[PDB]
Every structure is written in structure tokens, then in C-alpha cells.
Amino acid sequence: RRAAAAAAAAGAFAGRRAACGAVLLTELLERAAFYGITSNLVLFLNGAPFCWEGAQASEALLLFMGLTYLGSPFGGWLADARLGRARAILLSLALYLLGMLAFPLLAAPATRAALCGSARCCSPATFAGLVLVGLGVATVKANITPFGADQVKDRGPEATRRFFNWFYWSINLGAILSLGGIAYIQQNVSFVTGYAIPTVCVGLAFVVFLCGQSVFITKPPDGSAFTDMFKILTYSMSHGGPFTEEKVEDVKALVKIVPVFLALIPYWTVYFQMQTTYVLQSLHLRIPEISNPHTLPAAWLTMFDAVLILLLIPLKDKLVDPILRRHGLLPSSLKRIAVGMFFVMCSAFAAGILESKRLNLVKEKTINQTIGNVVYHAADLSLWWQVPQYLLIGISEIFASIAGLEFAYSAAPKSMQSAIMGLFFFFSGVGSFVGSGLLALVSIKAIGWMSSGNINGCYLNYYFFLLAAIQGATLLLFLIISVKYD
Amino acid sequence: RRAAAAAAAAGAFAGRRAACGAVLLTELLERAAFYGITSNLVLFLNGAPFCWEGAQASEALLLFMGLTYLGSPFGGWLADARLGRARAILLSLALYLLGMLAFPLLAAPATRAALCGSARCCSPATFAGLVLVGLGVATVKANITPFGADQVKDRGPEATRRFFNWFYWSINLGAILSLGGIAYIQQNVSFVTGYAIPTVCVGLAFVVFLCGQSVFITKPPDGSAFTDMFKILTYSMSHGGPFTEEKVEDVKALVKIVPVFLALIPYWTVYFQMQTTYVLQSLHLRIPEISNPHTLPAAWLTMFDAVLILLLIPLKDKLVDPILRRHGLLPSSLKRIAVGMFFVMCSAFAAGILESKRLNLVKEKTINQTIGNVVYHAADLSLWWQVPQYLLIGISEIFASIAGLEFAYSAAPKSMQSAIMGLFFFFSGVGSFVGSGLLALVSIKAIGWMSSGNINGCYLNYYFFLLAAIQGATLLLFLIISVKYD
Ligand SMILES: CC(C)CCC[C@@H](C)[C@H]1CC[C@H]2[C@@H]3CC=C4C[C@@H](O)CC[C@]4(C)[C@H]3CC[C@]12C
Ligand SMILES: CC(C)CCC[C@@H](C)[C@H]1CC[C@H]2[C@@H]3CC=C4C[C@@H](O)CC[C@]4(C)[C@H]3CC[C@]12C
Ligand SMILES: CC(C)CCC[C@@H](C)[C@H]1CC[C@H]2[C@@H]3CC=C4C[C@@H](O)CC[C@]4(C)[C@H]3CC[C@]12C
Ligand SMILES: CC(C)CCC[C@@H](C)[C@H]1CC[C@H]2[C@@H]3CC=C4C[C@@H](O)CC[C@]4(C)[C@H]3CC[C@]12C
Ligand SMILES: *[C@@H]1O[C@H](CO)[C@@H](O)[C@H](O)[C@H]1NC(C)=O
Ligand SMILES: *[C@@H]1O[C@H](CO)[C@@H](O)[C@H](O)[C@H]1NC(C)=O
């Protein structure tokens, strides 16, 4: 019946198999370049060409990441009011490549003198490159996600759900490629060759759109709507009556989806802190060697999470697209976010248990292992015991990560698409920054949880339990908000 | 509108304030007597009048508890087919008082010779008394709960929801009275006076119904329905067609509510194990003294849980009857069970954290404290640190315990009321027994979690984490079952 019809829709892609693979490949290459920059920025800045202090490099990376979140709302508005999505993404990719071209030249010893030969050694060029890269990334992220789902939007709302699966899969495949191959070359072979590859990736990602301009679905720009709902918004949030035709409906949609985005700040707060502290714990756990180029990169550890995601996304798809559809289970995009939050809390609890075990074991004996150029003191507890953690968050990223994008896409006005995604990725950055502040809070002398690269004297288990409690409170609040919204 | 109407219904009781207080008082007295028997049965059996071994007394108490669960389905059937609820409860209370009269006589030194003067010293009389008490308790429990809600059933389904709140409140008040006063006298003053009081409670509970026979709502017995849906059930589970008039509907209801009861076995499995191991942990924690009669009873520790429940039930009622009704939040009786399971899992995790802290602290120093007539080795960690546990389960008993009874009452055929409650209380016993088996499982030499009254050498934290995992899996399964049922 209806189920049969929906399963038949799941039979999507179909005609448009080109228009999609192009977007998937473009996002893969863009993510590969982004992770190539982000993985080893601090090592590059604190090295031979640049004599920046560790604090300066950390602040530079923090500003670069913050720019990629702050520029998203403005990148989305530019792609809706003044330009189309295709042209905006093309301009953003051109700017991203321009910012890309700076780092290989600085890495090269011959061309470094031309740029900055004659505190910070080469602050202007590096800052300009980082600003350009951040603006390009912010404009691409806020615009590629709705542009890709535009091709599959005609076949109802299950084709856009299948597309957002292989979009996340391509993102994670690009992350694996960048953090595995490029991050290895950047630290073992040379920085020139390690930074030339992501530039070539950006160059190839630009060619794909030019080749695929004949198969994409475009929408004419419309800034009149933005003017109507920004300039004369203060004149009113509802009850337009005879004045205005249906723009009051999209004003209602905006003011109704803002609270859902606001209630998701603690989710990102916990999620980014889990990204950081999980790697912190992995560094202090027994890591086996691979050979008899040395000192495997620390970025490889992050790969672990994404390594799960790939193996889950096909499987899940099959074992979720029939199984959960013919039974009418979990159809909405908000209950899936709730399930993701539940599994985030479970992962936090598992991490706390493992950290308590590690802190109990470390009092007996400790070994030294080198990662990069620094030796960490680790207990004699195998790294693979951290596998149960990464499953639970991985399942979370199966549910909460994709469903968040689906909700941001579907529950948004047609005119302001790619601008609601801008707010989504901006509130993600706000959550990341408040999470950094939370980490700074528990590090004070009054609490002393994170008073000290060795964490054998820091109670990471209490931090994990606090994150679990925050995630539980967020789960309850989000359940209430989702019920009220529906 | 509709909300207003429902809030007005909440304005219940109203006319029937007598018919209810009578049921509440009867259940209070019955629970006081039951907890008077259960609290100190082992101490009585292993003492001066009786020279039973500890294993024999434990087996006797286990059989007594198992009888109270096994007799529930048959007690409910007797109250529906052959008798009315009022007459069945009166007969059960008479039998309960008859079984009650045995223990004071055995405790008294003069009358002990008349009963058993001339292995187990007085097995026949004690076994007969325990059998009579168990049958009486089983028949009362399966019949008092639907009889009490019968008075308030006319004013829609919010009066039966308010009644089931003050019913649980009266149960917990009776538990506090029995475990605080009676359990104190049974161990400090004398067993004769400590067992005379619950007999007087049973006697008073019998008088209340005789006084309230003029204000109760009764239903004529109907065994023809039981014959129709038992004897010729094998002839068919649906599609009756011209044969039968609407009994196929109640057959459908039975076969549709059986899976929900089956999926609740792990809930009771975890809940009873939490009842036991929480007291086990409380015994090994620093307990302050009260005076300068000595050796406060161990049963007082159980009081802790119920001590919360009282303070929650009024408050909750108010802060849930307006607040959660005008907002249309959590109206069904199964989502409340799901919330209770969530809080059970959270309590298990908190208990595991506290147990890990206690096991870390015990390695430094240990103190000795006497409870009853046995000294426990306890860490120097305050007992009140166990408060966060008992809140989380207490909230659970606010949601899962009451809503389970509401679902058992509402989702049941009109003819088989008090027989579905029999199955409810029987599956509760099945869950209790499988929980006892689970505790016996983790005590084997292969696992060794509970290899040994001192638990300083037993990993209770791993047991708590296993209970939390079981509760999470039960939460997921129950969510799926509840969605399919609705
Ligand atoms: C006892 C004190 C702590 C009050 C507890 C309130 C919390 C525990 C309970 C009470 C009200 C509940 C919410 C009421 C609103 C809904 C909508 C319901 O359809 C799905 C669950 C959800 C999201 C509930 C989540 C849990 C909840 C927030
Ligand atoms: C979703 C939430 C409720 C999960 C519960 C996690 C929190 C509330 C629980 C888990 C472990 C619990 C702790 C268990 C052990 C200790 C150590 C003791 O020295 C003080 C109490 C304290 C600190 C408890 C505080 C509350 C606690 C931290
Ligand atoms: C609802 C469920 C999933 C909650 C998760 C609880 C379980 C699955 C988690 C919580 C703590 C985790 C443990 C953390 C620490 C250890 C000790 C180590 O020597 C073996 C792995 C092991 C044993 C992990 C096994 C999985 C684990 C027990
Ligand atoms: C990835 C693997 C572990 C599959 C995971 C399945 C579990 C995690 C998910 C998938 C399907 C989900 C259930 C689908 C059915 C429903 C009905 C929905 O309206 C409420 C939630 C509930 C009860 C979901 C609970 C969580 C659930 C059981
Ligand atoms: C660990 O490092 C410390 C500091 O250099 C050193 O003294 C100690 O011997 C090292 N242990 C091992 C096993 O290398
Ligand atoms: C605890 O009990 C043991 C065994 O009787 C005893 O030897 C020890 O001294 C006791 N400790 C205290 C503080 O009483």
C-alpha cells in the first residue's frame, strides 16, 4: 500500500545518476582538502619555516575553524539573494583554490623568499591564505548540501534521505583519504608534496562542476524574499492578513525552526568534546606498531571514528531502508536525532568506564610510546578496547548527523534554502566554542579535573560522566522541544 | 477546550471520597502486614524458637515469595468466575488473618508447645501459615487494584490515573510504617509484640470492608466468558465471523497485550536486583548512629527508597497534573514506562560509579559497623552519597510502576479484569526469579563477579553496569513493542 509506494520511491537515483555522483565527488575532494589543511596545521606552523609558538599556532587554527562557522550564514545569503547556488559554489571553490595555493609555496624553500623572505615570521601571507580558505569552506558547506539534494528532491522525501546517506559516506571517505594518505606524506615524506596533493584535489573538484553544468538542476536567485523578510520584518511575527501573500508562512517556519536549532547547541558541545578527548585517551593507550618514514601521524587516530562510519552506512542503509520502512518505525527526522543523543550518552558512559579502568591500571606500571615527535605515557591496556566507544558514537552519527541535515533541508522555506543550512553550521560552531569554554572551565584550580600533554593526573572519567549528564539533559529538553514543534 | 475538559476531570474523587479512602486504608494495612512478615522472617526462623539453617530459612522465604506470585492468576480467576471481587477479597483477607495468627503463637513461649511442642523444629505449622499468608496476599493483590479503580472509573480515564497515584502512595506509607515501627519492635523489644501488631493490622483491614460494603461498587460474577475463551479457544485467534458476538474482540485484546507483558520481564529482572544490591551496598557504607534497644534493623535501609516515593507522589501529582496535561506531553501509559526504564538505566550507571569509588576507597582503610547482630566492613564514604541513586529509581517508580498498573487496568477486557492483573503480578514474579538466576550466574568461578557477607572482594560495579546494559536493551525492545502495539 503506502509502504509499498514508499519502498518503490526508495528505488531513487535512477535517472539522475550523473548529477549526483558529480556532487558526491566534489564533496569528497573538498573534504579531503579541508582535512589535509586541518590535520597538520599546528605542526607546519611550529616547525622550520615558521617559528610560531604553540599558543600562536593553536589560536591561528582556532580562528581558522571559527571563520568556517561564522561565514556560513553570510555564504548562504550570498548564494540565495545575489547569485545562484552553482555560481556561488564555483566562486567559493575558486577562492578556496586561491587560498590553497599559498601553503605549498611557503613550504617550498625556493618560493618562500618571494612571498615572505623580507614574532610571526610570515603572518600576512599565512593569514590571507587561512582567511580565503575559511571563506571558501564556509561558502561551500552551506551551499553544497542543498544543491546536491536538489537533483533528487522531485522523487519525494525518500530520495533526499537516501542522497544524504551517500553524501555523508563520501564525506567520511574523503576524510579517510586525507587523514590516511595526505596526513602521512605531510609528516613523513615532505610538506611540499603533502600540500600539493590537496591543492590538486581542489583543482579537480573545480573541474567536476564545469563538466557537470549540463546535468545539474538550478534555481533562479530571489533576493526580493530576503528583503521582504528582513527589511520590513520589524513592521510586524504572524497574522499578516490581507498584507503579504504567503511570506507570513515562511516567517512562521523561521521562528518555529529557530528553537530546534537552539536546543541542539549542547549536542554539538558534547560531540566536539568527544572528538577531542577520545583522541586524548587514545594517545595514552597501548598502540601497536605497524613496521620494523617513522612515527605514524596522530591524525590517524581520528580516522578510527570515520573508519566505522563507512562500514556502517551501506549496511545500515539496507538494514534500515526495508526494515524500518515497512514497519513504520522511526520515520521522522527528530526522533532519529533523539536516538543519536541516546547513543552519544551511552558512548560517554562507556568512555568513562574505560577511563576509570585505565586510571586504575596506570598506577601499577606505565610505558612510553612515540607518536609523531612526542612520547606519551600509556597504560598496558590495548587500544582496541576503545572499539565499544566508537561504535556507539558511530551509530549516533548514523542517526543524529544525517537526520539533522534532513531536518534542516526539509523544514526550511523554499526561498531561504542554503541559508537555513548556514544557521545550522553556525550553531554547530557556537556549540563547538561553548564546548571549548566548558573544557576551559573544568581546568581551573577550583575543580582541577583538567589541571594538566600527560593526562595520567587528570580525571578524564569525571569529564566523561559530566558529558553524559549534559547529553541526558539535552535528550530530555530535545524530546520536549520536538514534541512541541510537531 | 479538550484540555480544559480533562483538567476538569482531574477534579475527581469528588463524590466518592469514602469509597476510595476505604480501599486506600485497606491496602495500607495489608502492605503493613506483608512487610512485617517479610522484613524479619529469616531472623525469626534462625533464632531461639527455631533452629533452622540459613539456607533453609532463605529457601522458605523464597518459596513464600514465589507463592504470592504464582497464586495471582488463579486468585484473579476465582474472583471473576466463581465470586465477586468484594467476596473474593473478603475470603482472601480471612485466610490471610488465619495464616497471620500462627506466627504470634509460635513466638509466644507458652503457646508454642500447643502447636509444635511434640531438622526443622516446627515445619508443619510454619509451612501451613506461610502457605495461607501467601495465598491471601496473592488473592488480595490481584483483586484490590481493579476493585479500587472501579469506584473512580466512571469519571473517565483521568480519575483512574489519580487514584493509582494515591494507591501507590498508600502502599509506600504502609511500607514505611511496617519497616520503621514494626521492624524495630520485632528486633529490639520482642517478637511476640512485633508480630501481634501486623495481625491487628489485618484484623482492622477486614473491618474496613465490612464497614464500607454500603458505599462500594460491585460487579456480578461472569464465568461464562471464561469458559467461552478457555474451553473452546482451541476450536479457533481471530476472524470469528458469524460465530460469537464480540468475544473475538477480547481474544484479540488478550493476544495483543500478552507481548507487552512478556517484554516487561527484564524490567522486573533489573528492578528486583536493584532492590537487593542497593541494600547490599548500603550495608558496606558509613552509616551514622542515632543514639548513645540497639542495633537498628537492616530493613530500615530499604525504607530509603520508599522514603523518597512519598515525598515525590504529591509533588509530582501537582507538578504533573496541570503541567503535563495542558501541554499534551506524555499522555500514554507506555511512554511513561519507557521514561521509567530510562531513569532505571541512569540509576544503574550512578550506582556503578559510586561502587567504583567505594572499591577504590576501600583499599586504603576500612571500618567496622554493626547492623543487627553482624558487623560489616565499610569504607569511610558517607551513606548519603547514595541519595542520587534512589532519586533516579524513585522517579522511575513514579513513572514505570504506576503506569504499568494503569496499562494493565485499561488495556484489559471488562470481563477478565483482575485476571489480567494476575498475569501482571505473575510475570513480575517470573522476572524476579530470572533475576535471582542472573545473580546466581555471575557468581560462578568462571566469571567470579559475586564469588563471595563481605562484598569488598566482589565487583558490584560490573554487575551494576551489566544491569544498565540490560535495561538499555530492554528500553529499545520495549520502545519497538510499544510502537507496534499502538
Ligand atoms: C520528576 C521530574 C524530574 C520531572 C521529570 C520531567 C522529565 C523527567 C519527563 C517529564 C515530561 C517528559 C517529556 C514530556 C514530553 C515528551 C513528549 C512525549 O510524547 C515524548 C517524551 C517527552 C520528550 C518527555 C521526555 C521526558 C520528560 C521531560
Ligand atoms: C543522566 C545522568 C543523571 C546520569 C547520572 C550521572 C551522575 C548524575 C551520577 C553518576 C555517578 C554518580 C556519582 C557516584 C559517585 C560519587 C562519588 C562520591 O564521592 C560523591 C557522589 C558521586 C559524585 C555521585 C554523584 C552523581 C553521579 C556522578
Ligand atoms: C546500554 C549499554 C550499551 C551501556 C554500555 C555498557 C557497556 C556496553 C560498556 C560500558 C563500559 C564498557 C567497558 C569499559 C571498560 C572495559 C574494561 C576492559 O578491561 C574491557 C572493555 C570494557 C569491559 C568495556 C566493555 C563495554 C562496556 C562495559
Ligand atoms: C544500528 C543498529 C544497532 C540498529 C539499531 C536499532 C535501534 C538502535 C533503533 C532502530 C529502530 C529504533 C526503534 C524503531 C521503533 C521505534 C518507534 C519509534 O516511533 C519510537 C522509537 C523506537 C522504539 C525505536 C527505538 C530505537 C531503535 C530500536
Ligand atoms: C619513560 O620515560 C622516562 C622519562 O624519559 C624514562 O625515565 C623511563 O625510563 C621511560 N620508561 C621506559 C619503559 O622507557
Ligand atoms: C575490624 O574487625 C577486625 C576483625 O575483628 C578487627 O581485627 C579489626 O581491628 C576491626 N577494626 C576496627 C577499626 O574495629
Side-chain angles (χ1 to χ4, degrees), chain A residues 117-230 232-234 236-463:
Chain A
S118 186
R120 285 179 186 85
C121 185
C122 310
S123 62
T126 300
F127 273 130
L130 287 156
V131 160
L132 275 176
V133 165
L135 281 193
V137 167
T139 313
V140 164
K141 291 184 42 188
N143 296 324
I144 193 66
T145 61
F147 184 56
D150 263 357
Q151 283 78 234
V152 293
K153 186 175 175 66
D154 194 27
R155 308 168 141 85
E158 301 276 346
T160 53
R161 183 175 272 156
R162 277 194 71 196
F163 164 78
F164 269 115
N165 282 349
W166 303 118
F167 198 65
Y168 212 75
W169 193 78
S170 81
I171 288 175
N172 290 115
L173 184 55
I176 294 313
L177 281 157
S178 177
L179 298 160
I182 296 172
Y184 185 91
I185 288 157
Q186 287 182 0
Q187 202 162 0
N188 301 21
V189 176
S190 282
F191 267 120
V192 181
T193 300
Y195 274 99
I197 298 297
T199 303
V200 176
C201 290
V202 182
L204 263 69
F206 184 110
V207 181
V208 176
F209 273 10
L210 280 189
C211 185
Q213 278 297 105
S214 301
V215 294
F216 283 163
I217 310 301
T218 63
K219 288 187 178 181
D222 188 14
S224 53
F226 267 87
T227 60
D228 286 315
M229 283 73 75
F230 197 77
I232 62 172
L233 186 50
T234 47
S236 51
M237 293 180 183
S238 59
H239 294 284
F243 191 72
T244 313
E245 60 274 15
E246 70 270 13
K247 294 180 176 67
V248 187
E249 186 264 332
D250 73 31
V251 165
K252 290 168 191 271
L254 294 174
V255 298
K256 185 176 180 180
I257 65 170
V258 163
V260 186
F261 285 167
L262 274 176
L264 271 164
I265 291 183
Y267 173 68
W268 307 109
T269 308
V270 184
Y271 173 78
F272 286 103
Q273 290 301 306
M274 291 193 179
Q275 288 204 23
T276 291
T277 69
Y278 279 4
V279 184
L280 272 184
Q281 175 185 9
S282 299
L283 288 166
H284 294 88
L285 216 56
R286 191 192 62 198
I287 296 166
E289 293 83 3
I290 186 166
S291 73
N292 298 317
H294 324 97
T295 70
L296 74 163
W300 276 24
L301 304 177
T302 81
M303 288 209 324
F304 293 160
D305 175 38
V307 166
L308 267 298
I309 301 284
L310 281 72
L311 316 174
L312 281 159
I313 281 181
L315 183 63
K316 189 269 296 192
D317 189 80
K318 311 312 207 301
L319 294 175
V320 162
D321 274 347
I323 296 297
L324 263 58
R325 195 179 292 116
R326 43 158 162 283
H327 285 350
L329 287 160
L330 210 66
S332 68
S333 301
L334 292 163
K335 296 300 186 293
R336 285 173 149 124
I337 304 175
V339 173
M341 298 171 152
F342 172 65
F343 280 103
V344 167
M345 182 171 36
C346 297
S347 169
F349 278 126
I353 297 167
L354 187 48
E355 201 46 41
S356 296
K357 180 65 178 174
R358 197 190 68 76
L359 284 164
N360 204 17
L361 212 63
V362 73
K363 296 295 289 185
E364 302 166 355
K365 63 178 285 185
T366 316
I367 67 174
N368 297 324
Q369 59 171 4
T370 187
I371 307 290
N373 281 316
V374 55
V375 293
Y376 301 93
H377 311 286
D380 203 88
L381 202 173
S382 185
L383 165 81
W384 317 112
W385 276 115
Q386 210 165 3
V387 161
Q389 294 179 357
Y390 282 108
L391 266 297
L392 293 174
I393 43 170
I395 297 167
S396 166
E397 308 186 17
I398 292 300
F399 285 109
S401 292
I402 302 164
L405 292 173
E406 300 171 3
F407 167 77
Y409 182 84
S410 74
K414 286 316 286 293
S415 60
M416 290 146 197
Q417 277 187 356
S418 73
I420 300 307
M421 291 275 198
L423 273 184
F424 189 81
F425 292 118
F426 169 71
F427 282 128
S428 163
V430 168
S432 163
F433 278 128
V434 72
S436 181
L438 184 79
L439 183 63
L441 169 63
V442 307
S443 66
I444 65 176
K445 44 213 181 293
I447 300 180
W449 280 351
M450 304 296 248
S451 66
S452 61
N454 196 341
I455 72 156
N456 291 328
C458 294
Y459 304 103
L460 201 48
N461 44 5
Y462 301 160
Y463 193 53

Side-chain angles (χ1 to χ4, degrees), chain B residues 140-152:
Chain B
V140 164
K141 291 184 42 188
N143 296 324
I144 193 66
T145 61
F147 184 56
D150 263 357
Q151 283 78 234
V152 293

Side-chain angles (χ1 to χ4, degrees), chain B residues 126-142:
Chain B
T126 300
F127 273 130
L130 287 156
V131 160
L132 275 176
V133 165
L135 281 193
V137 167
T139 313
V140 164
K141 291 184 42 188

Side-chain angles (χ1 to χ4, degrees), chain B residues 4 40 44 89 110 140 170 188 252 465:
Chain B
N40 296 295
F44 188 15
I89 296 178
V140 164
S170 81
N188 301 21
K252 290 168 191 271
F465 295 144

